[PDB]
Symmetry: D2
């Protein structure tokens, strides 16, 4: 009867989430900047396992090698004081005006080289802090108009960039993998590699595909009206779910980054059911923005809400799968048959099987109800805790 | 000053397009059925190069081997009489009630085996008629609720199915490739392999990836709010654009299948520019539905409109790229630099290049305007034929 | 601990809902036609209060005055046998090919006159069966292309039609009101009066506005990405919520008509909370389609699910509002202040109030957190039955 | 053969459009602030008729009565030097953190009173500068979660606010009307009065409805997937199109504010055709944002592009309507009949007209094609300048 998170739950937060000051396209900040050290302390008290960062969240852009050292030192001391881990790090290749046309796929060659150098420097830092995953979100890679970007040339530049980071990591002997985070649009009119599918496809064209996977975000796939759990299943099927960003989103519109559980509640249930049943072992990272209507107390309530909502859904999904009535319904809907090979007997035997065509009774097969509605209502009852 | 199509333009139409009777989810047919032989004659007169078909368009479901022979014979004679070709064929694995839960990924194993046998039979027919591409549109593969389909098991069944068709084609020595046509939703709540990206990713997991590519449709990618030309560029970059379905769609809503040129006009311009500049050599296939408000005369006007709109855009795109002012603008926006390697000098030289980081002037770089708006207005002027 | 519906709950269903045969734009029917008398019996056993119908659901198109009489007689006897009521009726001005360009706004004048006569005949029938509300869903009023419909002239024809039905009802002394059901698109490219707002605005231009209100549908407003509860609040505020259609919809895509509770679960919670708190006293009508994957047993399970889901949400919303912790949170977020007039003191006093401008401390006001996230998590806890 | 705008064309721009510095939710400004006086000079040279402003664009928030006077004086002198007019003004009730929960519908009563006082002060300024229209865009009126805002109470507060501004304007004897600008979402999760329809409906509940109309924006209606020209026709039909915001938007996603003509090109054509045929006489105001990739030269090219694109479409629409072949097609599609009353003979005569029902030949009527596709292709040919 308790939903208290503990570090063993592997809940993580970006510094930029609880640290979001509330500046939006139409308004000024509503909260003061949070010292990352304070963020780490508050999060550890809430039961979090660790934090993530962009280089620019930790070390202000333009810091001298000296101030940099100082900023890392204070951070490192907060991690030691709290026991918090840093499992993932990423680069800010979107805020500074130089990246207005992108980082790895900017038309200007000198900016692409700078983007790489900036990233490489942060990869060194990430390894030192113990991160296992390095995320790349190409927020500025894309266009508002068609002639501004030749997409085939942009994809060559993107592959070139990732191949170089792969050569770097391998030459240094680092134990770290990359994860590409898709987003369909915003802040560019259209962004390259807009969905999980596009990113997965792109990865197979890299020189060392085994080094790269995806970091899908609930809200981003939903901005394209796609089914998030289905996209995650395809990533898992491919062996490419290296990390995940959890949050909420209310349909096709701007990127909301609501707390996890908010937005599409049923999709959140099916997502938890899948992550737990597939045995996803990575961090449960929250990339959310406490709404700008909130003061600091609302910020911490929002973060606690993300973890609470995950734990409640995990309990409901587990009760759903453990329910014998549900196991019976799953067999009535033939989920058991879906998992059996269609033709382990082989092509030849299938061609010779008259029961597969010549003598197949299509009419009888057609008449068989799938019983999906009863199964779905059983799932609803479990979610709402209304199971008899 | 003429936009008359000729067979050399490679325009093709599905029998189900001009033959659509007008039955929609809320109303009865508004037109009588068209005899495929008549469809072939009318289309040849309009300047079309050929037609495509689903098995069930040509041979009514349940035909005896005898009537089948008769139907193919009459069709074949119309093709000989007109010189029309059949470059693509596909299977109907969606109309009959047996496929209500899918064909290759139905939960019922007996239906999956039947779907394969039905497909294999039509592949034999396709080769005989000279088709080079066999399209697969999994319209019924998917779900309306989360527990009805374990997506990892469904993907195993889908791969199993495609691998078997690949074994079949290779064992028979057929010269024919497969093309997967994505669609995000409708008629299922969510469809598997919902976008070009998801289909491309899936293909890399097949046993003989070289046999499969995609058959993207303008309207389907737009039902997910995605940029069609960008998706096509990624397919071309991957060497997987085996075929394409051209039509129009007005945003995120039901699958409209408006005539090509209708819907998002600018995207149609950028798509034509890309297909012609990349030297796409396959058919320009139209998968459209003449609206049910039309009589047969409106059906033929609609089909002629598809071809006319492609020819007009082709002329405008070619004039755009040939314009010296445009070539000058493209250099001002650094499209030339986008096409140059970021670091052909190699990783080591990039790491040692102080001009790439230590001494890079971010401020100067940032201040450089991209000149994208002038370029885009030049494109607009060309499209509207308002170029001085 | 029980969610059994009873006729006092005022749950109603259209004959076309449980009677949907499963024909969609890409497939044939998967279920046989249901005799309306059977539908009435099954629904009464489930705990329903009554049914609704389009003329064509009850009396097949083209029936002789004789067969018509017979069909009404059998229906009437089923209502007497079960105690079921008929609180609403409507016209089918969309299925028959004549209505391909609309009914009240068809370009052909002779069809508009026929649409009116067909409607008037059914209004007489509705009154006789005791219906209090007559719904109008202009599914075919609209266009796929811009020049096909002059919208100002179409609105004149629509107003003319409604004004005539108003004159008819008033001249006959009937006790019956009209309700306009909006839908943004499908089966037309764009439909006239696409949302609740457009319909409300249109009503104020009718000759006797007091005779007309709206019949909003959950899924239709969601097809435009709008907030359904907000739209319902505006209808209630205007005194125009005469009836309502409950169902589920998963975002911006084709009209799904999933069972109530499916789709956006949180919106369903907030909708129930609003209907119950505002004391909506009309029918709780379900306009849903049991998915075509189901057999008759799944049809009845789906219908029972609609009612169950409403009763569960009603219990959760009532517990939310009754919770003292929630009442405390509502005051912390100043919902109490929202309900107080901004300036009951009047314009002059506001202009002279220095505390309203000259001496207003914007900074202090700005710093006040709204506490919305804690309130929302309290709502989530109540919905999931996880309230301590 | 010329598309040069002149002040007689009535093209206007907001100071915040060409003055947009490029700050977005993910990045810093890419351009320096423009002095409003400079903006006025550059725009007059481009052929603009005038400018619009929010109070805070002209007078920086918190200015002393003294600096205010100075800022107005410099502005006024630029208008005199150039002959530029100021036909519309509006209030910034969204940037400052105090308005984080709204202005007129903030839960805090003290903020609602402040919002009114701030608005009233700017109305006085607007009249002095000669503005005929005062626009209200409630960007912060709304919510991210359901319990945060009781929408019926919010609508009472909104009506109360507008009624007070109406009392103020009437008591001062000012010649100025209000225009409500709808937007469905962003920066709030859902905004109140989300579409043209909702705003029109709301206006009929105000004390003096004749004082208020709408200021629809192309992109905002498109963020809800609605047909902009249709929404504008309904506004014109109601006599409520007081002003309009022109721009471009690519579908359902964040508010792009692309230059007019960009986005949905065909909708822009149909919009121009409607404004010119209905004789809309108000300003053609552009609310756009030159993309942040641009430098100042791209800013001015973008603004010139807005005007050019309107003039080109105006020429094409006029040629379309003047074409005798098009006038012939319009009669073939029965646009002439749409404009004729359905029953000027009256209810009684319609009831007695057997040709309207008893003897109506539905089959013959049904068989009549609408000829909409040929008409639409004629429109396309005209738009692309491909008319023989
Ligand atoms: O990839 C690193 C992070 O960068 C930015 O914060 C993006 O907004 C976020 O979605 C992404 O997760
Ligand atoms: O793939 C074959 C064809 O099957 C159906 O006709 C689909 O509606 C169409 O989009 C697809 O192209
Ligand atoms: O208005 C009567 C009914 O007609 C049709 O069944 C529409 O699909 C439904 O949404 C509407 O409620
Ligand atoms: O209403 C005044 C203006 O305020 C803001 O600039 C909005 O972003 C814009 O859409 C609106 O037109």
């Amino acid at each position: 009867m308790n939903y208290q998170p503990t570090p063993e739950d592997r809940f993580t937060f970006g510094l930029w989430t609880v640290g979001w000051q509330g500046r939006d396209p139409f308004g000024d900040a509503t909260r003061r900047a949070l010292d990352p050290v304070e963020s780490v302390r508050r999060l550890a008290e809430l039961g979090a396992h660790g934090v993530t960062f962009h280089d620019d969240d930790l070390i202000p852009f333009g810091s001298s090698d000296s101030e940099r050292e100082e900023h890392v030192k204070r951070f490192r001391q907060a991690l030691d004081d709290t026991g918090m881990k840093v499992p993932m790090a990423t680069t800010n290749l979107f805020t500074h005006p130089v990246f207005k046309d992108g980082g790895f796929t900017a038309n200007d060659r000198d900016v692409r080289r700078y983007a790489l150098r900036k990233t490489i420097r942060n990869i060194d830092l990430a390894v030192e802090l113990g991160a296992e995953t390095y995320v790349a979100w190409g927020g500025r890679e894309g266009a508002e108009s068609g002639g501004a970007k030749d997409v085939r040339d942009a994809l060559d530049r993107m592959k070139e960039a990732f191949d170089l980071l792969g050569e770097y990591v391998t030459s240094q002997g680092y134990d770290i993998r990359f994860a590409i985070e898709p987003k369909p649009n915003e802040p560019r009119g259209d962004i390259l590699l807009p969905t999980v599918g596009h990113a997965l496809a792109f990865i197979e064209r890299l020189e060392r595909p085994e080094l790269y996977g995806v970091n899908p975000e609930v809200g981003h796939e939903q901005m394209a009206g796609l089914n998030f759990p289905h996209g995650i299943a395809q990533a898992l099927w491919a062996g490419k779910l290296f990390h995940i960003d959890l949050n909420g989103q209310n349909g096709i519109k701007y990127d909301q980054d609501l707390r996890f559980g908010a937005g599409d509640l049923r999709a959140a249930f099916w997502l938890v059911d899948l992550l737990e049943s597939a045995g996803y072992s990575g961090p449960r990272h929250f990339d959310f923005k406490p709404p700008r209507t909130e003061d600091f107390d609302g910020v911490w309530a929002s973060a606690a809400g993300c973890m609470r909502n995950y734990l409640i859904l995990k309990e409901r999904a587990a009760a759903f799968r453990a329910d014998p009535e549900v196991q019976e319904a799953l067999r009535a809907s033939r989920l058991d048959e879906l998992a059996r090979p269609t033709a382990a007997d082989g092509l030849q035997a299938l061609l010779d099987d008259r029961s597969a065509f010549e003598e197949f009774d299509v009419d009888a097969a057609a008449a068989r109800g799938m019983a999906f509605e009863r199964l779905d209502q059983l799932a609803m009852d479990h979610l709402l805790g209304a199971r008899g």
